[PDB]
Amino acid sequence: GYLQSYVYLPNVDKHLSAARGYRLLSRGITGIFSAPALETQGFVTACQYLAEGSIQSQSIKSDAVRSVTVNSDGTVKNVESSSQTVSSMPRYVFPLDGDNCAPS
Amino acid sequence: AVVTAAGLAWLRQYLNPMGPDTTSVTGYPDGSAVTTCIADYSNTFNVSFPPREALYCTGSSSSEKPTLVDADNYAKIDKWSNYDITLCVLALPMLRNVVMLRLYPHTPTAFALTEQTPNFPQRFPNWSVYSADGTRFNNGDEPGYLQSYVYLPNVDKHLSAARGYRLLSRGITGIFSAPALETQGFVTACQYLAEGSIQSQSIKSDAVRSVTVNSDGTVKNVESSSQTVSSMPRYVFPLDGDNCAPSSLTETYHQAYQSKATDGFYMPVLSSSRDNPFHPPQPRAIAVYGSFLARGCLDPVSEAHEADGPTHDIYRLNVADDVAPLFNTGVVWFEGISPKFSLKLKTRTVLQYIPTSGSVLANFTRHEPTYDQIALDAADRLRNLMPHAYPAAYNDWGWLGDLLDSAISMLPGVGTVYNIAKPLIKPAWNWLGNKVSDFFGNPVARDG
Amino acid sequence: AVVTAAGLAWLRQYLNPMGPDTTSVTGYPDGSAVTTCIADYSNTFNVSFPPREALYCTGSSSSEKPTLVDADNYAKIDKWSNYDITLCVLALPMLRNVVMLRLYPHTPTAFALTEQTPNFPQRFPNWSVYSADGTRFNNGDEPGYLQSYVYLPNVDKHLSAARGYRLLSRGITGIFSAPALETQGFVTACQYLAEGSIQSQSIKSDAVRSVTVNSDGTVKNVESSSQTVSSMPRYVFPLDGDNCAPSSLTETYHQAYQSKATDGFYMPVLSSSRDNPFHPPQPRAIAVYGSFLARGCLDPVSEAHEADGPTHDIYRLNVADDVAPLFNTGVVWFEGISPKFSLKLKTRTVLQYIPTSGSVLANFTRHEPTYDQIALDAADRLRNLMPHAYPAAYNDWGWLGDLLDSAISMLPGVGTVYNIAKPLIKPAWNWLGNKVSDFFGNPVARDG
């Protein structure tokens, strides 16, 4: 369906490791486009908007345990339902509107 | 250096949502430079003592079965109707479910909520019954109170088709009526910030216990899964239910409104923050913070007692919504009301949308991203001076706008051009004694 | 005695719907004193040579069966793609179905239509094929052209929930693109009033013939029911299909627009009337007048030949809509276009609604019933001077508004205050030769 890649800066990782604190001062991205002659057709659209992410955990389900102790002396029958709703591990979630990110 | 017309209009509609002059609708003056459509929802409801047909049980009776009408325990509710009653309305910053109505036989000591999640909370025309012992009601119990949610469906429809939203203003009017010789009663109203947040309560898992007594099967998995984990996230409101009794609210907040019941009420709910950014619609289950019971690590204890620390009770409302952050929570009480009453609730909620492509909202866009710093500063300045509510008939305040907004817009910084506009004095909103004076000392003769 | 701001804004948005300055939307300046909401629909489509998946047969093949994709007669359409093609766009005053696109292997002599009603006309992304002999296409025939309708669904949704409507303005932009060394081609555009009306065509009933040959049954009902009656009413457009060829349009109308294909087009369709009243939504089947064949009573004949008089052919479009009356019909041709083309169609339709109670539109009302006689008179005055189209990139005309509207607003009557604004001269819109001069003689250097 599509291809995807991440553009990674390794020096940023190295320096972020050895830092007590940080803050981004500014960031710019330039997209110099080129194509063969008679192939320059196309359009470019660009937009910015605040997607205020936060540390959230999604709601997941545990697995209920089902045991059938059919033994003559062993008839515990631990049918307890562990299938409750819990929270997954925390992640930094971005509320970017994927459904509304089409160029138009 | 001077407040613009758009900023003044926004201030007027934010401080006086149901002012008769407030016909046009204006957006937040921050110059967002985004395509927006402003939607105004005006709704009217006629609340009174419900009949038996609109009463449902919240207990385990209607657990998997749908809502069950009361099995003619309505005789107890008629006994309620013998004497005077109490009617609470609680306006949380919920977008839909604008208010929550509650009917009591007599004034409670606190705004209690049930520890167990209720069954099928009912939208306004229908009510749901809760027992007197602060528990869900099944048929054959002692009813304690009735509860319902006033729901706006168009708000839900429009919130579905929106990239972002923000509440611009919200007002609630409570026009009260009762038969002749039955106008007795009192009304109290208050606003306060209950800054909710997305939290998960601490719950326990179930340890698995197996006794493999087989000759070859002797696994004996006695592992303790009974650890402490986090439940699913919910938007929790820190509303002080134990301190929501009318007397406590009256003696705590100076701007609280008190009057005779026949005066009704008019709450222009206000924001507690300077800014008002757009947010993506994200409905969540709503809950209310309670109080903790076990002190836990509030005293020197061991690790085994860390888990049972000060874990605050969380009361699930069984209602999902997206809330307007940084907006005040309102609460009004009608105490000693004749049971044959009639409250005309009128709600006006105006909020801004960023339309989604191809959605309905995209056909009503309105592109004037105006900017007005002075209006926002004036709103922040005025937040602490406006009374929390007014009599239902008290609209179109003369002091508002040309006098109050002008007399306050030139304190902020030195953003002042006119030398002196008008001195500002402390008003005395004594509606009970008919000694009301506005912000400039002009008496307010009774217009209703 | 001076044009107001609202009238000027309406004039700007009516003459230049896609002017970049036209951000706010304003209503018709007649002071209707009715609650109205103005809806602006901006849509974008990317038309090009369709693939086989989006082609359907209009013949009797898909009569009761739904639309049938071409049974790989697409080889003939590829043969079309070998050479240059022609692309017609026809903007009738239909509210939905804003334009009708048509693809020809080569320029036709007329805008033909099929006598038989087509099967399942296709909305834009899908096309429908018609045979070369001016008939509906079944698989295994000779394709003549492709046709599609560009449909706006939100317009339909809003028209459903409206007591009345009126079209305020409509513009169509045709940004053209093609590969390098393939930019060859020409574009022609024209507008003219095709004043449709509700008419019914003359059809024949079927005479019943019974031969009761029974011994006792000898009724012999030979009665002739074959009389001439009227079909169901349809909204018929008197568009001259036989005279819609590009050359005829160019040499008939002086304000017709001609240019190189790469210039695209920009048609601000205009109204042909001074007034613009509200009308109730009333969709009807749409049809186009043809030409008659039998002269009938155009010569001295008998009653038997009265029925077959000059009955004009009516071409059913198999499309139902409500039209904007008194609005011009536009037609643009792209002749000699490289088949590997790409036309970005952008349509902007702004129209006013009277909302129905409880409908969606009622949440976006806007009450400034402004009045401006001067603006309406200026629009009537300017109707005959504006060219029918401009190059796609030619927006934000400097002469428009502060110069043209001012220089024309003081001829009407003696409604003149400023002595002399600016002399008005006849422009020369020679886009082909790059010798374009506006209404005041200022040359228009190529901005694209």
Question: What's the per-residue H, E or C state across chain C?
Answer: CCCCHHHHHHHHHHHCCCCCCCCCCCCCCECCCCCCEEEEEEEEEEECCCCHHHEEECCHHHCCCCCCECCCCHHHHHHHHHCCEEEEEEECCECCCCEEEEEECCCCCCCCCCCCCCCCCCECCCEEEEECCCCECCCCCCEEEEEEEECCHHHHHHHHCEEEEEEEEEEEEEEEECCCCCCCCEEEEEEECCCCEEECCEEECCCCCCCCCCCCCCCCCCCCCCCEEECCCEEEECCCHHHCCHHHHHHHCCCCEEEEHHHCCEEEECECCCCCCCECCCCEEEEEECCCCCCHHHCCCCHHHCCCCCCCCEEEEEEEECECCCECEEEEEEEEECCCCEEEEEEEEEEEEEECCCCHHHHHCCCCCCECHHHHHHHHHHCCCCCCCECCCCCCCCCCCCCHHHHHCCCCCCCCCCCCCCCCCCCECCCCCCCCECCCCCECCCCC
Q: Rounded distance, CA B297 to CA B371, Å?
A: 50
Q: How was this structure obtained?
A: cryo-EM
Residue partners of C234: CB distance under 8 A and separation at least 6: C198, C199, C200, C201, C284, C285, C286, C287, C314, C316
What are the chain A neighbours of B213 within 8 Å (beta carbons)? 71, 73-74
How many of the other CB atoms lie within 10 Å of CB of B336?
A: 16
Count residue pairs from B and C with Cβ separation < 8 A.
29
Query: What amino acid occupies position C190?
Result: C
Q: Which of B158, B9, B143 is nearest to B72 (CA)?
A: B143
Which chains contact A through at least 3 pairs of Cβ atoms less than 8 Å apart?
B, C
What are the chain C neighbours of A40 within 8 Å (beta carbons)? 180
B219 — contact with chain A (CB < 8 Å)? no
B161 — contact with chain C (CB < 8 Å)? no
How many helices (DSSP H) and strands (DSSP E) are in chain B? Answer: 6, 18
3-state class of B165 per DSSP?
strand
* Closest chain C residue to the Cα of A104, Cα to Cα: C44
Q: How far is B342 from chain C (nearest CA, A)?
A: 25
C44 — contact with chain A (CB < 8 Å)? yes
Under an 8 A CB cutoff, do A67 and B230 touch?
Answer: no
Count Cα neighbours of C113 within 13 Å in the Cβ-side half-sphere.
Answer: 26
Q: How far is C368 from chain B (nearest CA, A)?
A: 10
B360 — contact with chain C (CB < 8 Å)? yes
What does each C-alpha distance from C384 to A81, C193, C243, C272 come to in angstroms?
81, 12, 21, 9
Which chains contact C through at least 3 pairs of Cβ atoms less than 8 Å apart?
A, B
Greatest C-alpha distance within chain C: 99
Tokens 């028209």, residue located: C159
Nearest to C181 among A38, A41, A104 (CB): A38
Q: Which of B139, B137, B141, B147 is nearest to B58 (CA)?
A: B137
Backbone gaps in chain C, preceding residues (C–N over 2.5 A): none
* Closest chain C residue to the Cα of B352, Cα to Cα: C364
Alpha helical stretches, state H, B234-311: 246-252
3-state class of B373 per DSSP?
helix
Which residues are B199's β-sheet partners?
B234
Q: How far is C365 from chain B (nearest CA, A)?
A: 9
- The number of residues in chain C equals 448
Q: Identify the H or E element spanning B106.
A: none
Q: Rounded distance, CA B387 to CA B268, Å?
A: 9
Q: Identify the H or E element spanning B382.
A: helix B373-382
Reported resolution, Å = 3.2
A72 — contact with chain C (CB < 8 Å)? no
C177 — contact with chain A (CB < 8 Å)? yes
Quick one: tokens of B213? Answer: 């007594």
Q: Which of B429, B441, B442, B339 is nearest to B391 (CA)?
A: B429
Residue partners of B380: CB distance under 8 A and separation at least 6: B274
CA Rg value for chain C: 25
Q: Which of C418, C384, C425, C422 is nearest to C402 (CA)?
A: C422
Q: Rounded distance, CA C302 to CA C349, Å?
A: 51
Whether the CB-CB separation of B211 and B179 falls below 8 Å is answered with: no
CA quadruple B431, B434, B435, B437: dihedral sign: positive
Under an 8 A CB cutoff, do B40 and C363 touch?
Answer: yes
Helix B373-382 × helix B5-15 angle, to 10°: 30
What are the chain C neighbours of B24 within 8 Å (beta carbons)? 367
C157 — contact with chain B (CB < 8 Å)? yes
Q: Rounded distance, CA B273 to CA B376, Å?
A: 10
What are the chain A neighbours of C44 within 8 Å (beta carbons)? 104
Q: How far is C24 from chain B (nearest CA, A)?
A: 6
3-state class of B41 per DSSP?
strand
Q: Rounded distance, CA B134 to CA B112, Å?
A: 7
Q: How far is C341 from chain B (nearest CA, A)?
A: 27
Q: Rounded distance, CA B394 to CA C120, Å?
A: 61
3-state class of B62 per DSSP?
helix
DSSP single-letter state for residue A91: E
Whether the CB-CB separation of C287 and C200 falls below 8 Å is answered with: no
Query: What amino acid occupies position B403?
Result: L
How many of the other CB atoms lie within 10 Å of CB of B429?
A: 22
Q: Is C193 exposed, middle or buried (0-12, 13-18, 19+ CB in 10 A)?
A: middle
